[PDB]
Amino acid sequence: CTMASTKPLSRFWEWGKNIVCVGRNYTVLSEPVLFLKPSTAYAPEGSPVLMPAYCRNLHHEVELGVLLGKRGEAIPEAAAMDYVAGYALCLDMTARDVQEECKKKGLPWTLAKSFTSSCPVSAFVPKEKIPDPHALRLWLKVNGELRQEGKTSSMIFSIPYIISYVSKIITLEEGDLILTGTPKGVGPIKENDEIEAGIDGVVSMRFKVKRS
Amino acid sequence: TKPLSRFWEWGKNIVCVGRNYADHVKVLSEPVLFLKPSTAYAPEGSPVLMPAYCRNLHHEVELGVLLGKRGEAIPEAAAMDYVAGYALCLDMTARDVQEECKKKGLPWTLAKSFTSSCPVSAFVPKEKIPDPHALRLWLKVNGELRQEGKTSSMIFSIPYIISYVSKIITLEEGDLILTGTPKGVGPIKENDEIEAGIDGVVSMRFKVKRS
Ligand SMILES: [Cl-]
Ligand SMILES: [Cl-]
Ligand SMILES: [Cl-]
Ligand SMILES: [Mg+2]
Ligand SMILES: [Mg+2]
Numbered sequence: 001c002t003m004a005s006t007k008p009l010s011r012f013w014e015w016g017k018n019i020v021c022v023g024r025n026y027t028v029l030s031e032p033v034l035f036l037k038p039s040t041a042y043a044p045e046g047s048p049v050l051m052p053a054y055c056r057n058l059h060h061e062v063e064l065g066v067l068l069g070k071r072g073e074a075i076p077e078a079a080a081m082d083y084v085a086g087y088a089l090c091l092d093m094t095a096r097d098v099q100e101e102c103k104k105k106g107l108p109w110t111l112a113k114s115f116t117s118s119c120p121v122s123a124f125v126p127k128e129k130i131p132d133p134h135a136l137r138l139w140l141k142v143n144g145e146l147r148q149e150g151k152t153s154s155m156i157f158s159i160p161y162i163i164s165y166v167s168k169i170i171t172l173e174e175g176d177l178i179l180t181g182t183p184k185g186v187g188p189i190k191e192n193d194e195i196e197a198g199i200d201g202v203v204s205m206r207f208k209v210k211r212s
Numbered sequence: 213t214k215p216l217s218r219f220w221e222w223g224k225n226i227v228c229v230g231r232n233y234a235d236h237v238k239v240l241s242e243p244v245l246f247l248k249p250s251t252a253y254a255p256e257g258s259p260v261l262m263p264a265y266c267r268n269l270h271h272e273v274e275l276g277v278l279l280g281k282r283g284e285a286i287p288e289a290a291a292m293d294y295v296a297g298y299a300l301c302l303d304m305t306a307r308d309v310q311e312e313c314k315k316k317g318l319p320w321t322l323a324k325s326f327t328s329s330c331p332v333s334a335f336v337p338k339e340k341i342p343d344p345h346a347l348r349l350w351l352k353v354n355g356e357l358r359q360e361g362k363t364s365s366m367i368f369s370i371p372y373i374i375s376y377v378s379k380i381i382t383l384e385e386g387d388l389i390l391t392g393t394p395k396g397v398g399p400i401k402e403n404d405e406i407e408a409g410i411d412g413v414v415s416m417r418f419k420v421k422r423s
């Protein structure tokens with residue numbers, strides 16, 4: 001089978017190897033902060049967000065995800081958008097107190113950012129549906145109440161810039177995903193809370209928060 | 213197909229422990245964990261590529277544990293049933309960048325997770341290693357011994373590490389865990405030749421090249 005019974009972009013979470021996330025993109029450094037999630041962070045719509053046992057302060061971060069359509073090694077910024085298959089709406093689910101400890105102790109962010117279900121993900125949005133990734137409204141509601149809204153025009157580092165920089169450090173494979181940061185309004189969730197989030201005019205998704 | 217013999221071709225995730233050897237310093241706190249991407253794999257035949265930004269590249273010879281099976285919250289007593297086998301690995305580290313990451317309280321990504329940051333030997337089936345904690349690892353640079361140590365010097369056992377990791381991160385078929393480096397970590401420069409092995413089991417050669 002030489003088809004999309006092999007690498008279907010509509011199911012990128014099933015076969016995608018790597019997830020790369022930018023830090024503060026809405027002190028900021030000369031470059032975007034980068035951290036990884038494992039493939040097993042993916043929570044496709046229908047999956048709950050799982051509060052880890054060790055987690056006291058679970059935070060939502062609505063983020064635009066950029067899906068790579070082809071292998072990219074030191075991708076030029078001017079070519080970067082030729083490497084994009086499309087987008088997903090994502091949550092960068094964060095154990096915020098663990099993260100405070102990680103920052104303070106100079107440890108890796110893995111227990112804060114990389115747990116099971118730490119990357120809820122919408123249906124695949126083909127590139128065609130988004131003329132301009134930097135002209136979108138991201139929104140997130142908890143129990144029907146708006147908590148984050150932000151414009152992707154507010155991004156400090158552009159998506160072509162991010163793809164380029166990341167690919168110079170980490171070769172990206174077909175189906176790798178880059179989370180491009182969260183606007184203002186990040187905040188906590190508790191067991192049995194309902195998250196709704198969307199990109200205006202493009203896609204919405206629902207997640208319930210549960211425990212292990 | 214997805215042969216475990218070629219796990220680097222298709223494996224999704226690499227998890228690495230911090231310091232797990234009691235034979236050097238460069239109520240026990242849990243093991244530090246960090247991730248490498250799939251594109252960290254440098255299978256034998258690949259060179260190690262020094263990132264442009266790197267001033268102080270370090271070798272870390274490590275025993276890699278390959279998972280055969282999906283595992284969530286694996287009990288320590290069951291952990292070894294999830295192991296398909298082993299690989300000899302290098303946890304290639306930009307040491308100065310790591311100091312910068314620690315100082316700012318940022319992720320260790322640029323220090324630990326670059327392209328080719330995980331050189332990897334031929335797959336060793338579990339059968340060939342009755343006791344993972346009774347192995348000698350060694351590494352030479354340009355013919356000169358730099359690291360040697362026993363996996364009996366590990367602070368946390370392999371079943372412990374698999375268990376702890378799986379409670380935080382579900383492991384897939386083909387995921388790899390690097391279990392730490394013995395004494396002798398140190399720098400390597402462009403055009404250095406690395407030889408490393410597990411006594412009685414496997415050896416590997418790598419050349420270090422630049423951008
Ligand atoms: Cl927390
Ligand atoms: Cl360095
Ligand atoms: Cl990290
Ligand atoms: Mg984030
Ligand atoms: Mg991965």
Ligand SMILES: [Mg+2]
Nearest residue numbers: 272303392393
């Ligand atoms: Mg190591």
